[PDB]
């Protein structure tokens, strides 16, 4: 059970400096194995960024650096550029049950535009869908930045996790982000509760919309 721990997200503005930690146990980093770092741009294969704790492959700018002290590995990026926006993974050989382990990854956001809270629109099931014996609540999330949200659904006030599908945010034509979340219900499920809620959490702040079967 060897584990490499990374922060889920880091952010910095263009031209600024960020660091990404990668901390291990004693099977991976404690035994003394080297840590390596991978950069994965959206829609691409991962790319080796740093190997052997601190070495750069040819072509990797000296803006990127790495170090490892005991069980603690770190990747530093100075002079942040918009092309640096990506997911970053540390990895190591280990002595444990898994010969190779990856950290959970770090989403790096380069804060090149202002933060914007999401606009939430919750559509109730259409008449057409209900006559087809189905019910889908459609929660549309628009005009937010950075492009990361958490969505939770509520039946009355109780959390519902079954029947939920949510998309990864992607860019609108106006360069802000949008996402969608769906709650699939039987018409009976829809009719039997007083109200349903889509709760969208963005940068620690929650915006919620509510629909009711009895309302119009």
């Amino acid at each position: 059970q060897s584990v490499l721990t990374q922060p889920p997200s880091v952010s910095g503005a263009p031209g600024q400096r960020v660091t990404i930690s990668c901390t291990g146990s004693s099977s991976n980093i404690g035994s003394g194995y080297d840590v390596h770092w991978y950069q994965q741009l959206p829609g691409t294969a991962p790319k080796l960024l740093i190997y052997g704790n601190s070495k750069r492959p040819s072509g990797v700018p000296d803006r990127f650096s790495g170090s490892k002290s005991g069980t603690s590995a770190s990747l530093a990026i100075t002079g942040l550029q918009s092309e640096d926006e990506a997911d970053y993974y540390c990895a190591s050989w280990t002595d444990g049950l898994s010969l190779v382990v990856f950290g959970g990854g770090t989403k790096l956001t380069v804060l090149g535009q202002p933060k914007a809270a999401p606009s939430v629109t919750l559509f109730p099931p259409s008449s057409e869908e209900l006559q087809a014996n189905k019910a889908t609540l459609v929660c549309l999330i628009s005009d937010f930045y950075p492009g990361a949200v958490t969505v939770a659904w509520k039946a009355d006030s109780s959390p519902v996790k079954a029947g939920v599908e949510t998309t990864t945010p992607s860019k609108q034509s106006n360069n802000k982000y949008a996402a969608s979340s769906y709650l699939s219900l039987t018409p009976e499920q829809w009719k039997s509760h007083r109200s349903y809620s889509c709760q969208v959490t963005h940068e620690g702040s929650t915006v919620e919309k509510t629909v009711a079967p009895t309302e119009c």
Partner: protein
């Protein structure tokens, strides 16, 4: 130039067997171990296993042990990842990469594997009926297979304020997406809004008019 080239995208059904490949060029394939890595949509990289192609020594993550077979044919510089019985949850991107003095310095381009029990099926299109004098309306494009669908509004004449979301692959094995448009509130009723949904794999064309609720 050192490269790893993977086989093309796969669309399969639960229970089917599948063997995907990773071909090395520009280096001695037998001399370096090949790792396989899973990436489920929106998630992190997960190490699956590794193979020494020289002697076929293979090790797996405890999570993948017994679920998959890694093998290699060093005579043709190819490593393989194999399932005897695909699960829907095997839907993911799969990468190979070589363990080198610079570890995983070279990665394959990835193989997308989609596993769904669905046959080809055209979508049902449902209207999503309608902030500073504007109203949001849209179309729910539900339960289709396979990708892709295309959506336009008013035959392509409405492009301003349109956003068509990426599809979700549901637990049913079918895709669903939505397309939304922001329009002036004052134009509702007086101006007609139609979403045009095309799904080629099933020769499906659907036009759905989206009209106000009127409460």
């Amino acid at each position: 130039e050192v490269q790893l080239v993977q086989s093309g995208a796969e669309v399969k059904k639960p229970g089917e067997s599948l063997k995907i490949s990773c071909k090395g060029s520009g280096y001695s394939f037998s001399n370096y171990w090949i790792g396989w890595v899973r990436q489920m949509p929106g998630k992190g990289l997960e190490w699956m296993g590794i193979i020494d192609p020289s002697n076929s020594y293979t090790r797996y993550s405890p999570s993948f042990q017994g679920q998959v077979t890694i093998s290699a044919d060093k005579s043709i510089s190819t490593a393989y990842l194999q399932w005897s019985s695909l699960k829907a949850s095997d839907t993911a991107m799969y990468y190979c990469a070589r363990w080198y003095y610079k570890p995983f310095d070279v990665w394959g381009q990835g193989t997308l594997v989609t596993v769904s029990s669905a046959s080809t099926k055209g979508p049902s299109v449902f209207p999503l009926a309608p902030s500073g004098g504007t109203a949001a309306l849209g179309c729910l494009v539900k339960d289709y297979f396979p990708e892709p669908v295309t959506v336009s509004w008013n035959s392509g004449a409405l492009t301003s304020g349109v956003h068509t979301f990426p599809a979700v692959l549901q637990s049913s094995g079918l895709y669903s997406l939505s397309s939304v448009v922001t329009v002036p509130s004052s134009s509702l009723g007086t101006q007609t809004y139609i979403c045009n949904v095309n799904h080629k794999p099933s020769n499906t064309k659907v036009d759905k008019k989206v009209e106000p609720k009127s409460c």
